[PDB]
């Protein structure tokens, strides 16, 4: 199942 695209970038750790 192809995961949905992000709405916006995740933050770095």
């Amino acid at each position: 199942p192809a995961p949905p695209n992000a709405n916006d970038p995740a933050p770095p750790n």
Partner: antibody, heavy 110, light 113 residues
Framework: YLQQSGAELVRSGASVKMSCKASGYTFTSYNMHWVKQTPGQGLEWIGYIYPGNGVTNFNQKFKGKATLTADTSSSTAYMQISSLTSEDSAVYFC?????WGQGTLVTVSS | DVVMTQTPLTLSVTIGQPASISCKSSQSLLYSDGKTYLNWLLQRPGQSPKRLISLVSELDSGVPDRFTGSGSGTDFTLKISRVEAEDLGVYYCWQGTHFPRTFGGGTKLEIKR
């Protein structure tokens, strides 16, 4: 799928805490956003939490008022808003990946 | 903040008519990973929003192929090839590149019958 908690009546100056339970996608892989819908149906971004590492980022307007947390063991996100005033009566949504919650209505009134 | 200007304010369309909605951002939405984080949403009357399109042009699962998204940089368009009755509601664009995240003002699509 995002399931939000029920509507709230809260007094001016008090706080409210609402929840958003996630299923059917990887909770920890996407920012969890909270969004206020204004009476004229504009949408206003409050902030997000990234449940993979807890990092939050906020709209400057809500800094010092909003607190965002995320429980990865139960895949639930929480938003607290403190010091409520009349302008905080609104529907609040959570949103993450392709999904939106159904909204939580908050009425600020004594 | 990056302003998202959506036009028109209202679309009054008949069933089968094409429709298009424009979203212009006040700054480029190209992010440093090479992606452009421009999403389109539909909120039908009485419901929560639903995402239709992400990354400018990529349809979400279940969205009819009558919908297409295009654009780059600051100028974006959502097109409906032929409107159906269930397409009514308010469409919003929203950008995920800049802080704060921001939304367009909405376009209300109403059906003439």
């Amino acid at each position: 799928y995002l399931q939000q908690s029920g509507a709230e009546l809260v007094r001016s100056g008090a706080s409210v805490k609402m929840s958003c339970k996630a299923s059917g996608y990887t909770f920890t892989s996407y920012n969890m956003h909270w969004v206020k819908q204004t009476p004229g149906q504009g949408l206003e971004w409050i902030g997000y939490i990234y449940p993979g590492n807890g990092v939050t980022n906020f709209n400057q307007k809500f800094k010092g008022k909003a607190t965002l947390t995320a429980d990865t063991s139960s895949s639930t996100a929480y938003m607290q808003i403190s010091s409520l005033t009349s302008e905080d009566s609104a529907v609040y949504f959570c949103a993450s990946a392709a999904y939106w919650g159904q909204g939580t209505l908050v009425t600020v009134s004594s | 903040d990056v302003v998202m200007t959506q036009t028109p304010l209202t679309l009054s369309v008949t069933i089968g008519q094409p429709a298009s909605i424009s979203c212009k951002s006040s700054q480029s939405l190209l992010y440093s990973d090479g992606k452009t984080y421009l999403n389109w949403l539909l909120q039908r009357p009485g419901q929560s929003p639903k995402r239709l399109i992400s990354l400018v042009s990529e349809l979400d699962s279940g969205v009819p192929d009558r919908f297409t998204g295009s654009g780059s940089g600051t100028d974006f368009t959502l097109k409906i090839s032929r409107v159906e009755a269930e397409d009514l509601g308010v469409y919003y664009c929203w950008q995920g590149t800049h802080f704060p995240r921001t939304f367009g003002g909405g376009t209300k699509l109403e059906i003439k019958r």
